[PDB]
């Protein structure tokens, strides 16, 4: 049985996925295909320029249809190729079950006839330049209409979009309307009173008053930002706000009592009118980013009584000459009694002290505080001890320098208190910086130039710290007492620290790993450890070690000094020895790895041989990863009986053949990656019995020997459930004509 929707892929939830197939038109699927099981059809990024009456006409249960990026407009086309999509009149009418349509990024100039089942319609980046009562007549179900980017720099129209008065009044269920990047100068008259989300950003609506929002009292989100922009630091075409604008009247929003979110970013505001927020008693989110409010926020009263507000964005309110603002928050920030999140990144100010955030200090719910990219170079970090609810501070990308004058490395996201000081100019860490920060659970100091002696005296106050990121620094030398002042430490990232001339004539002392009793995850990746190191790592607690990007090759050529290097990690589960220049491997060196290992990576070494019988010496191994080595074959014995191996990756080798029965004895094997090798066939004999056990068999990017009709294709059709991208991504290597084309290309489809 062929893939039922060739060239496309059936996926979960009745989705036929035809994305990215260079298709010139919509496939006419066969009669025996389960056309009725199809509820969603995706055709993203093909090149269908002509749609017909009969294209969708027999998909009796089709609900979602995505035709995005098929006939892109000149301006959006990389090579400015003009495109005007032809759409036969009944093309969509013939899908009377259709509920969701995405026609974005296509050269269409009018709304085609749509059935009245439609609930969601996306027409963004098309060339529709008019909307009137005849445009979406009778679509009484429609809840979402998105039509952004029909007239802007990447898709110009020489004029404005025209939404006629009442054009959409017939749409009595329309709750979501977006009309950004349409070159509009006023808000369309008489929009459905049912609207709850109205996004009008990035037009040229430079003036706003309460009648512009007439009758829209169900509005929960209003976005009118980017309508009189500042252009000093784009990037892309941008029209500056004309001099005496914007003109927001003082009671514009005062009848929108259900409003939860309000966006006034990039509106060139030098000043806030307190009256704008009067009556907005449900307002939880306010975005004032990219304005000119650096001076205003030191004295404003506009925030008084926004007692329900939970998120406030003031980011990129910076002097356009590019210099420091003097930041002292106005007292009315203190009235934000419900504030959970405050974003103040990219304002630019020299100093973080007691004065700076004073009015915030006692807000009982304030949890997240974004202060990155401010070029702060003096910070009193003690100020954060007396914030009652702080969970996260981002001070990354500043120039602070001291006190005042995933499976291998977990994230800090569920922790109670995290401070990120990455990308500052920290060279040395004084322990008094954190004297008022005993409660910190996660500390990030990556991408500094820390070249200090780490000797057990740097982080003394931080008695609660569970996670320390010191990756990407200039740490010279690890001592036996390094990090031993951190009693509760669970994760430690030291990746990308490599100063081979600065070791003071000695080597790394890795005995500190044995001193950290709660440590679970350690990374020493890209440290350039060739030599000059302790002979043994020892830990009863450690679960994951990333040792990638060193030279164990050199270590293990150096006699037998380093043959038990990892053995003392009595509970190691995950070990990454990828990128270690490993040319050979003794079975005696593999058996000296911790017996508890479940997962071993050797991505990107130079291994041309592997003794597969030596996998008995790792009885608990479940995932083995040998991607990117030089295996020429899978041979020299087979996978031995009893192996617990479930995931095996041998992608990106030069595997030309596999011996018969190579995978026969691996009864737990479920996932096998054979992608990007040199295979010319796929054989059932490789798996003895048990081929139907595999849940994933990836055989893409192989130079398969396509012939009419090769039996390996029979095999892949039999186990097609496990083969990802079978209908399109499993390709031929020969003959010359079918080279790089699908194994089911027109020519070969005759031989089935
Ligand atoms: C099998 O291996 C191939 C090649 O290594 C994988 O393809 C890569 O997938 C990663 C993400 O997993 C991408 O970053 C790369 O861009 C992909 N490269 C190529 C050439 O495809 C593939 O994902 C793996 N398959 C499975 C099922 O894990
Ligand atoms: C926006 O409208 C003006 C005046 O109607 C026009 O000159 C300009 O070209 C339009 N912008 C685009 C991107 O087409
Ligand atoms: C490692 O560190 C401790 C000092 O705290 C020392 O006693 C031990 O002998 C050192 N080992 C080496 C090889 O230098």
Swiss-Prot record:
Residues that bind DNA? 20-24, 45-50, 68-82, 105, 125, 152-154, 181, 235
A single GO BP term for this record reads: regulation of B cell differentiation
Q: In which tissues is it expressed?
A: Expressed in airway epithelium, vascular endothelium and inflammatory cells in blood vessels of the lungs (at protein level). Highly expressed in pulmonary intravascular macrophages (PIMs) and to a lesser extent in alveolar macrophages, neutrophiles, type-II alveolar epithelial cells and bronchial epithelial cells of the lungs (at protein level). High constitutive intracellular expression in leukocytes including polymorphonuclear leukocytes (PMNs), CD4 and CD8 T cells (at protein level).
Q: Where in the cell is it found?
A: Endoplasmic reticulum membrane; Endosome; Lysosome; Cytoplasmic vesicle
Q: Establish whether keyword Plastid is in the entry.
A: no
Q: Which residues lie on this side of the membrane: Extracellular?
A: 1-752
What is the gene name? TLR9
Q: Which residues of the full protein are shown?
A: 28 to 810 of 1031
Q: Is-annotated flag, keyword Transmembrane?
A: yes
Query: Which sections of the protein are LRR repeats?
Result: 35-58, 60-83, 95-120, 123-139, 140-163, 171-194, 196-215, 216-241, 256-279, 281-305, 306-329, 336-359, 363-386, 387-405, 412-436, 438-461, 462-485, 487-509, 516-540, 542-564, 569-592, 594-617, 618-641, 643-665, 666-689, 691-714
**Subunit structure, per the record?**
Monomer and homodimer. Exists as a monomer in the absence of unmethylated cytidine-phosphate-guanosine (CpG) ligand. Proteolytic processing of an insertion loop (Z-loop) is required for homodimerization upon binding to the unmethylated CpG ligand leading to its activation. Interacts with MYD88 via their respective TIR domains. Interacts with BTK. Interacts (via transmembrane domain) with UNC93B1. Interacts with CD300LH; the interaction may promote full activation of TLR9-triggered innate responses.
According to the record, which residues are glycosylated? 37, 102, 173, 183, 215, 282, 313, 414, 455, 509, 611, 636, 673
What family does this belong to?
Belongs to the Toll-like receptor family.
Main location as per UniProt: endoplasmic reticulum
- Modification note: Activated by proteolytic cleavage of the flexible loop between repeats LRR14 and LRR15 within the ectodomain. Cleavage requires UNC93B1. Proteolytically processed by first removing the majority of the ectodomain by either asparagine endopeptidase (AEP) or a cathepsin followed by a trimming event that is solely cathepsin mediated and required for optimal receptor signaling.
Say which species the protein is native to.
Equus caballus
Q: Using the chain's own numbering, where are the disulfide bonds?
A: 8-18, 71-83, 151-157, 228-241, 231-238, 412-442, 706-732, 708-751
Protein keywords: Cell membrane, Cytoplasm, Cytoplasmic vesicle, Disulfide bond, Endoplasmic reticulum, Endosome, Glycoprotein, Immunity, Inflammatory response, Innate immunity, Leucine-rich repeat, Lipoprotein, Lysosome, Membrane, Nucleus, Palmitate, Receptor, Repeat, Signal, Transmembrane, Transmembrane helix
Q: What is this protein called?
A: Toll-like receptor 9
- In this record, residues modified by a lipid of the kind S-palmitoyl cysteine are 231, 238
Q: Which GO terms describe its cellular component?
A: cytoplasm; endolysosome; endoplasmic reticulum membrane; lysosome; nucleus; phagocytic vesicle; plasma membrane
- How does this protein lie in the membrane? Single-pass type I membrane protein
Q: What task does this protein carry out?
A: Key component of innate and adaptive immunity. TLRs (Toll-like receptors) control host immune response against pathogens through recognition of molecular patterns specific to microorganisms. TLR9 is a nucleotide-sensing TLR which is activated by unmethylated cytidine-phosphate-guanosine (CpG) dinucleotides. Acts via MYD88 and TRAF6, leading to NF-kappa-B activation, cytokine secretion and the inflammatory response. Upon CpG stimulation, induces B-cell proliferation, activation, survival and antibody production.
User: GO molecular-function annotation terms?
Assistant: identical protein binding; pattern recognition receptor activity; protein homodimerization activity; siRNA binding; unmethylated CpG binding
Q: What does its record list under induction?
A: By mitogen phytohaemagglutinin (PHA) in peripheral blood mononuclear cells (PBMCs). By lipopolysaccharide (LPS) in cells of the lung septa. This induction is abolished by gadolinium chloride treatment which depletes pulmonary intravascular macrophages (PIMs). By synthetic class C cytidine-phosphate-guanosine oligodeoxynucleotides (CpG-ODNs) in PBMCs. Synthetic class B CpG-ODN does not induce a significant increase of expression in vitro in neutrophils of foals aged between 2 to 56 days nor in adult horses.
């Amino acid at each position: 049985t062929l893939p039922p929707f060739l060239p496309c892929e059936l996926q979960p939830h009745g989705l036929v996925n035809c994305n990215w197939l260079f298709l010139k038109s919509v496939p006419h699927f066969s009669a025996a295909a389960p056309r009725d099981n199809v509820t969603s059809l995706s055709l993203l990024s093909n090149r269908i320029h002509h749609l017909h009456d009969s294209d969708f006409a027999q998909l009796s249960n089709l609900q979602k249809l995505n035709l995005k990026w098929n006939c892109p407009p000149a301006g959006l086309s990389p090579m400015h190729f003009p495109c005007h999509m032809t759409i036969e009149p009944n093309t969509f009418l013939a899908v009377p079950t259709l509920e969701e349509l995405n026609l974005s990024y296509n050269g269409i100039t009018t709304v085609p006839a749509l059935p009245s089942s439609l609930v969601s319609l996306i027409l963004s980046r098309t060339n529709i330049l008019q909307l009137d009562p005849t445009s979406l007549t009778g679509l009484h179900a429609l809840r979402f209409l998105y039509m952004d980017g029909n007239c802007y720099y990447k898709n110009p129209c020489g004029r404005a979009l025209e939404v006629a008065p009442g054009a959409l009044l017939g749409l009595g269920n329309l709750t979501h309307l977006s009309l950004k990047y349409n070159n509009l100068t006023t808000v369309p008259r008489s929009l459905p009173p049912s609207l709850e989300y109205l996004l009008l950003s990035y037009n040229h609506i430079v003036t706003l008053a309460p009648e512009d929002l007439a009758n829209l009292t169900a509005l929960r989100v209003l976005d009118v930002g980017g309508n009189c922009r500042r252009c000093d630091h784009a990037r892309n075409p941008c029209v500056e706000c004309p001099h005496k604008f914007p003109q927001l009247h003082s009671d514009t929003f005062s009848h929108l009592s259900r409003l939860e979110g309000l966006v006034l970013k990039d509106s060139s505001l030098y000043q806030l009118n307190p009256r704008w927020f009067r009556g907005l008693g449900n307002l939880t989110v306010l975005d004032l980013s990219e304005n000119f409010l650096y001076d205003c926020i030191t004295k404003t009263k506009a925030f008084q009584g926004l007692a329900q507000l939970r998120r406030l964005n003031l980011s990129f309110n910076y002097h356009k000459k590019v210099s420091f603002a003097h930041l002292t928050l106005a007292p009315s920030f203190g009235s934000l009694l419900s504030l959970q999140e405050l974003d103040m990144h990219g304002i630019f100010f020299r100093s973080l002290s007691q004065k700076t955030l004073q009015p915030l200090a006692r807000l009982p719910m304030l949890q997240r505080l974004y202060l990155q990219m401010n070029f702060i170079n003096q910070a009193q970090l003690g100020i954060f001890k007396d914030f009652p609810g702080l969970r996260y501070i981002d001070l990354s990308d500043n120039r602070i320098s001291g006190a005042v004058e995933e499976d291998f490395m977990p994230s800090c996201k569920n922790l109670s208190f995290t401070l990120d000081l990455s990308r500052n100019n920290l060279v040395t860490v004084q322990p008094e910086m954190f004297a008022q920060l005993s409660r910190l659970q996660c500390l990030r100091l990556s991408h500094n130039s820390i070249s200090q002696a780490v000797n057990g005296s740097q982080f003394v106050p931080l008695t609660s710290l569970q996670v320390l990121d010191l990756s990407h620094n200039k740490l010279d030398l690890y001592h036996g007492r390094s990090f031993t002042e951190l009693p509760r430490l669970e994760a430690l990232d030291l990746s990308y620290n490599s100063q081979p001339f600065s070791m003071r004539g000695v080597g790394h002392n890795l005995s500190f790993v044995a001193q950290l009793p709660t440590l679970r995850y350690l990374s020493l990746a890209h440290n350039g450890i060739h030599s000059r190191v302790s002979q043994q790592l020892c830990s009863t607690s450690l679960w994951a070690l990333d040792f990638s990007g060193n030279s164990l090759s050199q270590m293990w050529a150096e006699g037998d000094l380093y043959l038990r290097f990892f053995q003392g990690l009595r509970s190691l589960i995950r070990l990454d020895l990828s990128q270690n220049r490993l040319h050979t491997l003794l079975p005696c060196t593999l058996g000296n790895l911790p017996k508890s290992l479940q997962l071993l990576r050797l991505r990107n070494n130079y291994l041309a041989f592997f003794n597969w019988s030596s996998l008995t010496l790792l009885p608990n191994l479940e995932t083995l990863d040998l991607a990117g080595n030089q295996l020429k074959a899978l041979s020299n014995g087979s996978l031995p009986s009893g192996t617990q191996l479930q995931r095996l990756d041998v992608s990106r080798n030069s595997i030309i053949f596999v011996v018969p029965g190579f995978f026969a004895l691996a009864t737990r094997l479920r996932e096998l990656n054979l992608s990007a090798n040199a295979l010319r066939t796929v054989e059932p004999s490789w798996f003895g019995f048990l081929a139907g056990s595999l849940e994933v068999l990836d055989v893409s990017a192989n130079p398969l020997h396509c012939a009419c009709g090769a039996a390996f294709v029979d095999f892949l059709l039999q186990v097609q459930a496990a083969v990802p991208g079978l209908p399109s991504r499993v390709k031929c290597g020969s003959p010359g004509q079918l080279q790089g084309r699908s194994i089911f290309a027109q020519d070969l489809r005759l031989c089935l």
